[PDB]
Design an enzyme around this catalytic site. Structure first.
Site, PDB file in Angstrom:
ATOM      1  N   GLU A   1       0.828  -1.084   0.149  1.00 56.20           N
ATOM      2  CA  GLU A   1       0.064  -0.070   0.079  1.00 56.20           C
ATOM      3  C   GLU A   1       1.034   1.201   0.124  1.00 56.20           C
ATOM      4  O   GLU A   1       0.544   2.077  -0.784  1.00 56.20           O
ATOM      5  CB  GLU A   1      -0.890   0.154   1.226  1.00 56.20           C
TER       6      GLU A   1
ATOM      7  N   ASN B   1      -7.914   9.251  -5.248  1.00 58.83           N
ATOM      8  CA  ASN B   1      -8.680   8.278  -6.044  1.00 58.83           C
ATOM      9  C   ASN B   1      -9.505   9.028  -7.158  1.00 58.83           C
ATOM     10  O   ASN B   1      -9.871  10.251  -7.050  1.00 58.83           O
ATOM     11  CB  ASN B   1      -9.622   7.704  -5.171  1.00 58.83           C
TER      12      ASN B   1
ATOM     13  N   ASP C   1     -12.937   9.137  -7.647  1.00 56.53           N
ATOM     14  CA  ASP C   1     -14.003   9.830  -7.071  1.00 56.53           C
ATOM     15  C   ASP C   1     -13.749  11.133  -6.012  1.00 56.53           C
ATOM     16  O   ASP C   1     -14.507  11.721  -5.562  1.00 56.53           O
ATOM     17  CB  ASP C   1     -14.695   8.795  -6.364  1.00 56.53           C
TER      18      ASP C   1
ATOM     19  N   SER D   1     -11.839  11.212  -3.340  1.00 56.02           N
ATOM     20  CA  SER D   1     -11.411  10.932  -2.103  1.00 56.02           C
ATOM     21  C   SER D   1      -9.696  10.502  -2.044  1.00 56.02           C
ATOM     22  O   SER D   1      -8.992  10.603  -3.293  1.00 56.02           O
ATOM     23  CB  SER D   1     -11.924   9.652  -1.431  1.00 56.02           C
TER      24      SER D   1
ATOM     25  N   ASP E   1      -6.326   8.559  -0.286  1.00 54.32           N
ATOM     26  CA  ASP E   1      -5.845   7.272   0.580  1.00 54.32           C
ATOM     27  C   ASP E   1      -4.628   7.995   1.517  1.00 54.32           C
ATOM     28  O   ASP E   1      -3.609   8.666   0.788  1.00 54.32           O
ATOM     29  CB  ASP E   1      -5.399   6.246  -0.013  1.00 54.32           C
TER      30      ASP E   1
ATOM     31  N   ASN F   1      -8.800   5.567   3.356  1.00 60.47           N
ATOM     32  CA  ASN F   1      -9.619   6.277   2.634  1.00 60.47           C
ATOM     33  C   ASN F   1     -10.529   7.198   3.262  1.00 60.47           C
ATOM     34  O   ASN F   1     -11.250   7.044   4.043  1.00 60.47           O
ATOM     35  CB  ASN F   1     -10.348   5.352   1.548  1.00 60.47           C
TER      36      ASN F   1
END
Ligand SMILES: [Cl-]
Ligand SMILES: [Cl-]
Ligand SMILES: [Cl-]
Ligand code: NA
Length: 129
Positions: free
Chosen positions: A35, A46, A48, A50, A52, A59
């Site tokens: 990750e 991301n 959309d 958002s 991380d 998220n």
């Protein structure tokens, strides 16, 4: 902070992740490796809108507040910036809520695609734990 493999294993064990919800310590170290490459300051946006955050790439759509993800939740009750600290406590405590949520560690895409079903014990081999 960029953790070493065994240093992170020891910190995760101290914070109670070993066998948490049945996931052995190697699963958590493997997830962090893919990750974030063990870097507490990692961020990734991301599609959309958002973002991380941190060593486990938690998220902002559901888990933390970053002030720029409209209509999102803050289920861990923390600013997302707290997940970037060199102290992994906030990330671990939030991860415990995520993994209890029903889908287990499948919530982490890199764990599903790169750790699940592999010899995850290799991630803690040689470490004094
Ligand atoms: Cl393990
Ligand atoms: Cl927001
Ligand atoms: Cl599970
Ligand atoms: Na949020």
């Amino acid at each position: 902070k960029v953790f070493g493999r065994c240093e992170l294993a020891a910190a995760m064990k101290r914070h109670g992740l070993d066998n948490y919800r049945g996931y052995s310590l190697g699963n958590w170290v493997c997830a962090a490796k893919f990750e974030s490459n063990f870097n507490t300051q990692a961020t990734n946006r991301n599609t959309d809108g958002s973002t991380d955050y941190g060593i486990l790439q938690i998220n902002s759509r559901w888990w933390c507040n970053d002030g720029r993800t409209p209509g999102s939740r803050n289920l861990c009750n923390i600013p997302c910036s707290a997940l970037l600290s060199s102290d992994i406590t906030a990330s671990v405590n939030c991860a415990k809520k995520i993994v209890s949520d029903g889908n287990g560690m499948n919530a982490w895409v890199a764990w599903r695609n790169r750790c699940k079903g592999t010899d995850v014990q290799a991630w803690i081999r040689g470490c004094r734990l």
